[model samples]
Target: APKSEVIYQVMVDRFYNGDPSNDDPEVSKGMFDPTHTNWRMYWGGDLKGLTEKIPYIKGMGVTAIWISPVVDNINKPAVYNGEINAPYHGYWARDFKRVEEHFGTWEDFDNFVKVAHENGIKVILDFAPNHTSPADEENPDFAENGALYDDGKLLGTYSNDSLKLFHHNGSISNWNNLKELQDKNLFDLADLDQSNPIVDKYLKDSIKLWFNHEIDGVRLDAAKHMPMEWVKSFANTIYSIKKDVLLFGEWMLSGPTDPLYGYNIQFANTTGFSVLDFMLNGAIRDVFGKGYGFERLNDTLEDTNKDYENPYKLVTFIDNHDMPRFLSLNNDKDKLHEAIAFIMTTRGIPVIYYGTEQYLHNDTNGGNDPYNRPMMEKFDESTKAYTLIKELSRLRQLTPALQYGTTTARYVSDDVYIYERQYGKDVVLVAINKGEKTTVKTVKTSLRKGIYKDYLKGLLKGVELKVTKGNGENLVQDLTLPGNSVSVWTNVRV
Candidate 1:
């Protein structure tokens, strides 16, 4: 029963502090810092810190861990005195081959993967190939490969100036201009020109280094910004080195139907990689927070799966360190439960952000950035939300029908949603009531005569389940669903 696939996304700067020894006063700033904004600020979560908390993550039935980019940091401050400065979220890479000193050394990173593998957990490393840190006069450019300078001149400024940057004048522009992001300032980062042959080699070699470190796979950031051709090359090169390496792209959009969203997913598959299911994540969040129903969920799944090469490869998540936690959206534990339920039960690989089960958040920035990534809070393992996730993960591991089975919507409404994951002889039925406790509805069960077990309410033996019952159906039974409650019925043949 070693069904290990669920991944927990942990932001090292915000997860835990096992070792205060390597804590730097400058980098290990408090998590609630309001002035220190942007993606570069660190909140002191490190490798040792993460290593100490592996048991806590494993205890929750997590079989894999996806961490923020541990690649080398910018080495210098990205912002001078701006209120919203970058805190080095591992996005501003100075060197892809080396581990960020802010997080830990290369040795520390090796130990991290080693420790994780020892615990039967796979480690997915977040990667940033889109850009590097902007010009810092003091530190200059550490990357040896730089041809284009900020000025129009190609060699003079770049060759003479200590800072070397990837010059992309015709590559792209701002959102205001569709010309491309070439010379535009998308934050204070230098966009690399993947078209360069040398640059391509550098990027590929850097990725190989991670594989050499025994890392499980990579999650590419700002995937669209990079050219599709380059991504394909990147994926092919990495796959050559690590055959089983899983690659996922961050497409940062709501649904899969959008042309732009479709493009990203297409490129991911073209590159022999998977995409983070932003479409499904957004739908689940909206359903749990904005009261969107299971119908929306069904639509999202249908649209995303129709065009995807392999929909199950998509990495499904509710929230990450970059965005506000799901609990912050509605502040309702019930809604949070529903969100987690959708993520755990729905198709694709599930990824949980750190501290989500504990309802962790800080209002310092209205639950944004550093505020969303608060330190781990000590809570009982038996908490309802925690127990629910544990049980659901355990059940999911035991049932291949929920993982590899084809999903079909049985019934969907604003108040109630039901679906079934079916394969050959195994079937798993899921029903959820997103409304208050007073709402009553019944979903038509495809399984008519077989005895089934309901995990949420214990076992149901010889129960005659209705299949066509709706809010006002004549054959409907009074199936009262507590607000934000999810029910799972299993081992039924439909």
Candidate 2:
């Protein structure tokens, strides 16, 4: 709705450098070995560090940024291999009222927001309400060994403390307890009872305080397991106050169809705030790539929008901090290029996780959590994929129609996929080749008669486009997209 925007998601800890002065190695011993080979360890990319990178971020044309949570965490151990660990991803929230000192102070966070705002970039804070740290014996908030909720209604929980902060209604159960999520690790976290009125007020007030700081949006982490009614209520309340603020709920494991057993897109739409398009990811990966076909991409787009209140509101991405990097699907850089092109040019806001330009890849334990989140690094910008992304992002910004346009499938095949995005007389044509190198033998479409500019190569009218064969004419001249590549032709005849 606000034009096509590019969002950069960063892991604050590994993004930049760690300040030893602020680092706490004792809380979770040996986890702060900044010298370790594991880039996942904390490196101190705090609010100040992010603030310092405002110019770099702005120069890259990032319109928005989604940071990992900054909420306070108890000085607790993040165990890895049966030893104390550190909170590198920022999901282990210990106190909603306080900002993590390791990241920075409240004042530093406030300054970071101000800096980002001045640069015309919106900041979306990550909100993790689904669970809390494992209730340790020393933790005051720990309850019943950090159960989702305590036997009694208490918001905070500890193993030593039997009382929790919320009512122990049978309404909620552990992820493993649920028949659908037996295989997933629900993390032995203490879940808060949002059903409790006091807990609700506290969270709502915390959000309001964040809003007062002028943050533009919020990414609601792990909202699927929480009560949908509470999510809607919270969204409604947040919007009632800010009006323009955007909220994205992470309905964990949500997919496109109704039968996935996990959170579905339709239900997410009904839950109020927008949801990240996991269904889109599956369509590209499972259906299109792994299944060795592209029809599923068409089928997904055809129905993905119909079920949601506003399809464009969904966040689109090929990889995130949660799963395998896009490259891991296949080492083919061309396929990765095509995937990036599709999401960035399609009908929704595009989010790119950091280090994607570097073509970072990691395969850990079949590629799980901490492995997926690698440190950000300076990578080459001259590669075909990087150029493709830069040009695609620029094109999306230049043509608002691409952001808000109505999408129509032009062509579909296992090796090729074509779609047209048009708003009024402005139009953009996209063609992706998921297979190996092949030239378009013919061109047939209403978009056959235009001298188009190819964004990727930044070449202008170097070749004439005439539909020479098929129902229309063969306009695309000797266009050969190497395997795993995507090309976009913009009509300059406006």
Candidate 3:
């Protein structure tokens, strides 16, 4: 399902505000803010609002929706980094059993999932297994210290030694040390001692509760902070409950050359989990945003295929909640279009961060978090980015080669690249030019001799490619792409 579907990641509090009744001051004080001035404060975007926009999202051909954490969070707000922060982003989990009041009730979430499924969209909930909310007045230190059963019963702290549930180690001082990185507190959150069998069982049971709710998948947060054994155990337990569930982890690293690449691959292979392709994200930034070159992206893809067991299973994205939007670095909409075209056509499941289609960015110190998460304000289908995405989504849906095929580079240069996605007889040839001027290159390909039309064309009209036999048993074609433009051609019309 992941391979064939494009995922739209939504921060619920910033997506839309459909039901103002849930955003009343009495119901959600200090959490719901409509001005949208403060990045830390919630903008009242809720499940109802997201539910109302299903048609808008479906219009873009998104088959899956990955939402922020829906678990109940601590009531009291905390001052972090000199700003008063509530659990608007839903990462600080207080109770796994209840839904956040700011979002909606349990019934609301159930209906949201039901509606998404009815629209042929899968729902992937963001799950945090590494930590819980910090100890505060509303959430005591031993709040999560309990033996959680598969039957949804939580035995009190008296059932076992509460001290064994969490690691008492202080915050990490040495990030290079593996033990400290796994055991120490991350952002002052309570780190779970996943090595403990009782704690492991509790975490597994809590996750199973969601799987039983018919959720299609889980996006594991902070997966690298936990041990590989624990990750494998958690994945295995979840698979036992729901065999077809899609599981991916946030093993966030910068690039393939990073020192942590080996560790990231270890997690990917050992846990039987797909991971977010941060290496590809870095490549996209350098190539399109910084004008490095197209070879940089080609290099990353080659490294990814060599390093990971199943590269196609990874989730590819240009921007996410933790990082800055692509537009913050480069304001050129053409560059953004080329970047999106590459990700949609390349390997892995493409994930579009919310508001990207509208070219949203806050530009605060390179659009870093808090600033990266802006509210969704527009759903205009005619926008270039939205229209391009819709066409690519349709192409991805109609072409099985784009989803499950193997990639072969037909042409590679400093600023131009052409690759073929081939599966049996199905083929999709993608040409991209990142230079400041139009480039025409003759490239060798396995595509049969025929006339092909550019499937995604804007401004430039009537772009076509003619493939003819170059040598014995080989076909070659010449492709001309304008600066910062992408052209996708298929054997069959789409």
Candidate 4:
């Protein structure tokens, strides 16, 4: 379980490069780009680069690192509308059983995981079993025709898939239709038919290799594209192989009220998996990134907590490789600060995107995909965002209130919201304001009757708290929350 873990998502090729030798391996030579000019090529980040940064990652109070897929991709690049995109992202997989040679050899991966474990960091590998690389059955010129392999031996290709291992239907044309969403392709990528026993065995067997390498968890990609029964069987097989293995899926949704909301909930509850909290993610982004009202997040906060069997097991994040970064949406660092504070203090296992601490983003083309990803710039611990993550994540690791407490809204308005989480005597109070600097007239909390100080120590704004009982409830009167800032007052520690 990732209940008490703070995960750092790493896009491997864009992170860091510890070795220049493997950057341009013989088969995939043209994919390496050291100048960082091309967004479509590998930037030389490999397992060795990440292995060397364990200390830097550990300093941020992160307990786990969720790395992108490292499987061998189609031996060449894929072109769409004259634009070339190399398989640097590792999502265009060809050989599921072997590591991408550009990322490094199998020995490099073994050493990387071994070293990360030595430093008390859990490693979560991104596993995309929903499909292989992009392929069209009629378009023989496209991307190895979505070949599937075992080590070096060719098991099958999309064009050669007589056994119906890969879906032949065209790319999905409608996202609103359930049949289209589940049965059709997601973009040009070939969708794997998990209903087939061959595909089921192949996926299950390939994962066993990584588990043997001591990977602590799996962040399943395109989980919504498969049937719940297939995913449930896969989950069962994974646990049967190893215990204490953390498993979560990426089942993207708009918000809590999405039409598929109940379906996703059912999938999570029955599949033995926790999904990315897209419901609250949309609310958080709208509120902080676009200057929306605090009310936008209020309902989602309450619903997500109650609907999920274990909300803490769900992973939370503001942005990922698929979307624009938080800063790209709105350059205001305060909004970024408030968003980070909310996720860190509120619920779920928080995942801080790599370079989010350094404020790394490419605003080119409004920071869209491929553009949303950039080569890692610098690792500066002095940055304010880095400091906030370190402090709040420290609290997440130490306080039971932040980890497992039941949450309640103390006070809520369009712009000002105050909430508290409490488990017995352990209490965590969070106050956020997106409007102009103003004093909250009066807010109520469940904290024990006492005085407390801001746990952030002025990272956002320090607020001295005075809690007193009025009749049957505790009240915090005239609490001042700085504009566009967040304040967390906790009774767990000084």
Candidate 5:
């Protein structure tokens, strides 16, 4: 499942609004202005909305859907950076046992899960175990507590001393400091003291509730901020409850040299938790968006192979809710095609951000946060990107080599790259070019001598490769890729 499944990450509030009756007037008031001027407001998307869109998502070749946090959030909005920030993103959890009213009641969520499963798509819930909403000082829910269970069950209170459920060292001032990162508050969110046994128990029980609901996996949020020991312990607890449950964390790193990268590697090796491939994301931005050389992409792939035990287990993507869309920096759709083709054909499971297939980008402030997350507006499957992604997804599904094979670089240059994915007897060659001119290169391969047809015939017309025996019985083939295009070929006749 980890090696072959493609994930579709959706922010619930930015998806679709299916039920108008459940839009709480009191909580949603002042949230939606119709002008969409406030990114902090809720857009009325709920469980029913997501449930209604399962068929659309399934048709996109998505095997799994990762939804934003569904736990009940703080109803009152908090002022941050002089703007009222509501918990519309579903990260500020107030009650773990209850579903967010904005999303729906427990029945709605259960029905949503049932529908997704019926459509043959797994459900991965986004979980935030690192912190909770910093209680409003003026109108606090739990006057003296920092951690509370459902029905106002107080687990522990906050104190300056080291005896409380929360760390009171204030927000992090130094991101490089390991101690501060594990214990310090993130943007003033109440950082839970994972060292406290009671706090750990509370979190484990809360997650168990989701496991009982048959959640297939979890996308852990803010995993880098949590201590390694705590992460392992939590992972162990989850595995004990559900042996098959998959856990992938959002341990965003800048590059291979980033401290967070080392931390993630340690966690993956020690705790057996998969992580998102931020290194690949960074390389995509540099090579495709900023016109950097292809070596950066090749180097990162080598680094991932060296650092990660199983590179195929890592989740890869070009854009997400936190960063700018790929088109924001480079509006060229052809280059975007090359980027998408690379991710889908390379190692690691590919995750398509909502609306990415439709070439959606708000173009606000270079498509930075709030702008990166525009509501799902178009569902046209005939767009170039949509067609490309659909075809690539099909190729990945049909070719065993694309899913489990070892990758070998045949040709690498500033603007063109050629690689092969080879399994026992299955060989798939992928060639991509990012320049404005066509690129042609002859490279060695492991496939038997034969005529191989390009699987992307719709995008790259009349593309055929002839492999012949070279020195020492090696196979060599010449590949020509159109400018700003990608082509995939297989030894098996199409």
Candidate 6:
């Protein structure tokens, strides 16, 4: 497995605006939102914006940054529900090989990569190969009609797809049909034909060009909408050329028991790529965000741990740009803290969405889509979430137990979750209490007989543990956990 990483997922366009010159950039006028009120419009954030915030991310102990897509997007906006939705988020690709000018030019991106590598931060660019902008051949004015270009040379358009680069079928209505799901347009977006040799080479080369820029990883967008075999070849082609790249895709799961659970895991295994831990995300939200208790969360963890090939590499997060931020619907900060702490010390690599450390959330529309991504208003380092993330992230960064440890549940209850991560001689025991101050009567741990210190180090305002040698595993007697706190005690001194 790759050395564990604490990733900071950045929706770059909403992060910051470092350059005013690239804000509107001619014909792309109406989409710019300088006031930051129109959630659908561009917030003027650019590459330089994020590049400048490297220190803030690094301070939170983030080893990698999962950025939104950077492919040059369509110049005009698309009409969705009577709103001229701009390609601020870099998802509506118009040019595969060129950088989005609204975010910045090639020089800006090069500087960003240079600076990030200099700071030991790995860059994971979002690669949306599933489709281009929302389009329809019947109504070309609605959008760019999935216009694809190669560095200024027009390759083809969905409306005039003579090159057979795109699937001309109408937008999908029924998701139940597997063939239709893979072939039809999703949300009226142009679907690329991966089997088509032109598109095959197009996507492979697009990613290879980015890898040539020294990008460390690629987050494959809309993985479920594409053929598993095609995606497999895509991954194979990229890694065969650039073996150092870390490839993960977004395979969303509605719940832990979603019928697609088995299928989702098989997709990742077959494709030889990692995926976002949506099941774990759902359970964490229920427990910490909506008070669903630790018992419910523990059960979810059980299935999650057993299903994946390498759960350790799966990207784990509380909330992302597609859903409501943790603070949006949930008012409790301590619960958010517990969730952050849980992910930091638990199995997979943890991800912190942009501005989450700053408690930024817009409740409008329940914080969905563009609302979930509000303009980053502040970068204060003193926020409790910021401090909690800082300490836990730093601990995960240095501790071998967090990075590669095998997670085993030592104790479980409706109110508390206590688990130990054991790797070689390093053992990390974590206790999370949700209900009230209570004592976990008895539990066995891999932590040796010693007074283990909380690596969180009082940052969570929580307690530690004392273990004594037993007939079998070490016995942790009467582990007193404070209400609404996440406590981590590890044998590793560093």
lDDT of each: 0.67, 0.67, 0.79, 0.86, 0.79, 0.85
Query: Model 2 — which ten-residue stretch has the worst lDDT?
Result: 458-467
Write model 1 residue lDDT over 136-222, tens digit each, in one string: 323444322222322122332222433333653433445433236434434545667677765677778778878989988888888
TM-score of each: 0.84, 0.86, 0.92, 0.97, 0.93, 0.97
Candidate 5 has a TM-score of: 0.93
Task: Supply the TM-score for candidate 3.
Answer: 0.92
Quality of model 3 by C-alpha lDDT: 0.79
CA deviation > 4 Å runs, candidate 4 = 1-3, 255-257
Q: How many backbone clashes are present in model 6?
A: 0
> For model 1, how big is the CA root-mean-square deviation?
5.6
* C-alpha RMSD between model 6 and the true structure: 1.4
**Model with the higher TM-score, candidate 2 or 5:** 5
Predictions: Cα RMSD each: 5.6, 4.5, 3.2, 1.6, 2.6, 1.4
The count of residue-pair clashes in candidate 5 stands at 0
Per-residue lDDT of 109-218 in model 2, one digit per residue for the tens? 89989999999889998987765655444544432344332212234454433434533333334443443232222455555667667667777887887888888888
- Report the error of model 5 at residue 364, Å: 1.6
Give a tens-digit lDDT track for model 6, residues 108-213.
9999999888888999999999998888788777778899998889998887888999997878887766688789998878999998999999988888888888
Stretches of model 2 off by over 4 angstroms after superposition: 25-30, 38-41, 136-155, 160-163, 166-185, 254-263, 287-291, 379-384, 441-448, 458-464, 467-482, 492-494
For residues 1-494, write the lDDT of model 4, one tens digit per residue. 12488899999999989999998899866767778888898889999998998888988999899999999998877877877678999999998899999888999999999988987889898999988988878876886889888898887888888778888788889776778887888887889898888888988999999999999989999888888888898889889998888899999896556788887888878898789889888999998898778887988888888898888787899999988999999988888888888888877788899999998889998999888899888999889999999899888766767767888988788888888888678789998887878887888777767888778887787677898887778887887777776788887764
Residue 128 miss distance in model 4 (angstroms): 0.6
In terms of lDDT, model 1 sits at 0.67
lDDT of each residue in 1-494, candidate 5, tens digit only: 23477889999988888987666556445555445567878878889999998888888888889999999877667765667777788888767777888889889999998999998788999999898776533334432224445645545434332447677777888987788888898876788888888678778888899888889899999988998888888888889888877688998786657865677888767766789889889998899999998989988888887788877788899999999999998997877888888988887788999988888898888899889988888778788777777777776777657756788888889998888897777788887778755646467877777777778884843266778877554565446566776767787544
Count: clashes, candidate 3: 0
